Design an enzyme around this catalytic site. Sequence first.
Site, PDB file in Angstrom:
ATOM      1  N   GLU A  46       0.768  -1.235   0.000  1.00 54.14           N
ATOM      2  CA  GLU A  46       0.000   0.000   0.000  1.00 54.14           C
ATOM      3  C   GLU A  46       0.823   1.324   0.000  1.00 54.14           C
ATOM      4  O   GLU A  46       0.472   2.275  -0.698  1.00 54.14           O
ATOM      5  CB  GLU A  46      -1.048   0.005   1.142  1.00 54.14           C
ATOM      6  CG  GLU A  46      -2.142  -1.018   1.026  1.00 54.14           C
ATOM      7  CD  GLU A  46      -2.834  -1.035  -0.341  1.00 54.14           C
ATOM      8  OE1 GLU A  46      -3.173   0.071  -0.856  1.00 54.14           O
ATOM      9  OE2 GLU A  46      -3.107  -2.148  -0.889  1.00 54.14           O
ATOM     10  N   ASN A  87      -7.696  10.203  -5.691  1.00 54.16           N
ATOM     11  CA  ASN A  87      -8.507   9.291  -6.505  1.00 54.16           C
ATOM     12  C   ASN A  87      -9.398  10.077  -7.455  1.00 54.16           C
ATOM     13  O   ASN A  87      -9.625  11.286  -7.274  1.00 54.16           O
ATOM     14  CB  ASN A  87      -9.328   8.344  -5.601  1.00 54.16           C
ATOM     15  CG  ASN A  87      -8.456   7.586  -4.624  1.00 54.16           C
ATOM     16  OD1 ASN A  87      -7.375   7.129  -4.991  1.00 54.16           O
ATOM     17  ND2 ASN A  87      -8.894   7.482  -3.372  1.00 54.16           N
ATOM     18  N   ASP A 135     -12.570   9.784  -7.967  1.00 49.17           N
ATOM     19  CA  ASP A 135     -13.908  10.216  -7.513  1.00 49.17           C
ATOM     20  C   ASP A 135     -13.847  11.486  -6.663  1.00 49.17           C
ATOM     21  O   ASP A 135     -14.867  11.958  -6.198  1.00 49.17           O
ATOM     22  CB  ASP A 135     -14.632   9.102  -6.741  1.00 49.17           C
ATOM     23  CG  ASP A 135     -13.935   8.737  -5.437  1.00 49.17           C
ATOM     24  OD1 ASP A 135     -12.696   8.949  -5.312  1.00 49.17           O
ATOM     25  OD2 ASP A 135     -14.622   8.219  -4.534  1.00 49.17           O
ATOM     26  N   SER A 153     -11.954  11.470  -3.766  1.00 52.69           N
ATOM     27  CA  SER A 153     -11.365  11.050  -2.475  1.00 52.69           C
ATOM     28  C   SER A 153      -9.822  11.020  -2.567  1.00 52.69           C
ATOM     29  O   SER A 153      -9.242  11.161  -3.642  1.00 52.69           O
ATOM     30  CB  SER A 153     -11.942   9.695  -2.015  1.00 52.69           C
ATOM     31  OG  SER A 153     -11.479   8.673  -2.888  1.00 52.69           O
ATOM     32  N   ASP A 202      -6.392   8.595  -0.826  1.00 54.09           N
ATOM     33  CA  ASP A 202      -5.912   7.559   0.086  1.00 54.09           C
ATOM     34  C   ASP A 202      -4.807   8.044   1.008  1.00 54.09           C
ATOM     35  O   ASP A 202      -3.890   8.701   0.535  1.00 54.09           O
ATOM     36  CB  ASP A 202      -5.388   6.382  -0.715  1.00 54.09           C
ATOM     37  CG  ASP A 202      -6.491   5.591  -1.414  1.00 54.09           C
ATOM     38  OD1 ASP A 202      -7.701   5.955  -1.354  1.00 54.09           O
ATOM     39  OD2 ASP A 202      -6.130   4.589  -2.067  1.00 54.09           O
ATOM     40  N   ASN A 239      -9.118   5.333   2.584  1.00 55.34           N
ATOM     41  CA  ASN A 239      -9.845   6.280   1.745  1.00 55.34           C
ATOM     42  C   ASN A 239     -10.751   7.350   2.451  1.00 55.34           C
ATOM     43  O   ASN A 239     -11.461   7.067   3.393  1.00 55.34           O
ATOM     44  CB  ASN A 239     -10.656   5.414   0.774  1.00 55.34           C
ATOM     45  CG  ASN A 239     -11.505   6.198  -0.115  1.00 55.34           C
ATOM     46  OD1 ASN A 239     -12.707   6.350   0.134  1.00 55.34           O
ATOM     47  ND2 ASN A 239     -10.906   6.725  -1.179  1.00 55.34           N
TER      48      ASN A 239
END
Lengths: 167, 126
Positions: free
Chosen positions: B35, B46, B48, B50, B52, B59
Amino acid sequence: ACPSQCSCSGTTVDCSGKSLASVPTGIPTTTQVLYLYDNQITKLEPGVFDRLTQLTRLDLDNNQLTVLPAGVFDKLTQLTQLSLNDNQLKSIPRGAFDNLKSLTHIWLLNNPWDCACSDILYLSRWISQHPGLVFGYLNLDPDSARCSGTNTPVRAVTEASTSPSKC
Amino acid sequence: KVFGRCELAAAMKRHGLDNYRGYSLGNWVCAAKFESNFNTQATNRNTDGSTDYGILQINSRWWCNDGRTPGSRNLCNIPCSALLSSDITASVNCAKKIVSDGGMNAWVAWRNRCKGTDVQAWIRGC
């Protein structure tokens, strides 16, 4: 004109976390974003969104939806994000995502998908055919829609492990 | 802060990740490797809207608050900046929440690279 139960601002209508059993009346038809998440909606009326043709985002997640009306999303051709996770859904009505030509993100996980039944086949095929659209609780994840009981991915389910007698 | 492997294993154990919900320590170390590469300040915007955050790339749509993710929830009740700390406490608490609300299957790189391997290798010499 904001619905009584909700908060509004520009083109966003937040009806979230309000203990609602159905979609409130009087959502302006200019609405682009509709938050319905975290309620107790069990059934949507057929045509409930047909006037909301400008929706680019719709959150339906975290309710008690057991079944979706056929054509519930047919008029939503500008929708980029739809959230349906964490409901009581067993299948998606055949063709229900077909008009969603602007879709970039859909959440499907934490539903009892019923992979024994033949109605799951539209969803299985649809996920397989849209490998970049489905998201889990973190990132992109086409396997996040999982069969109740067996916890295997819906997109893996094919016609031979299903039956029309189990619906 | 970039953790070493044993340094991170050590801190995950004392936070109680070892056998949490039946996942041995090495699973969580293997997850954080793919990760963030052990970097607590890993950040990823991201499509959309969002982002991370942290060692396990948690998220902002669902789990933490960054004040810039519209219609997002804060299921862990934490600022997403707490997920960037050299102190892994908030990232461990959020991860535990994720395993229960969802298990480790949420971390796709773990599912593909770590799950079902000799994951206690991640723990050798610690």
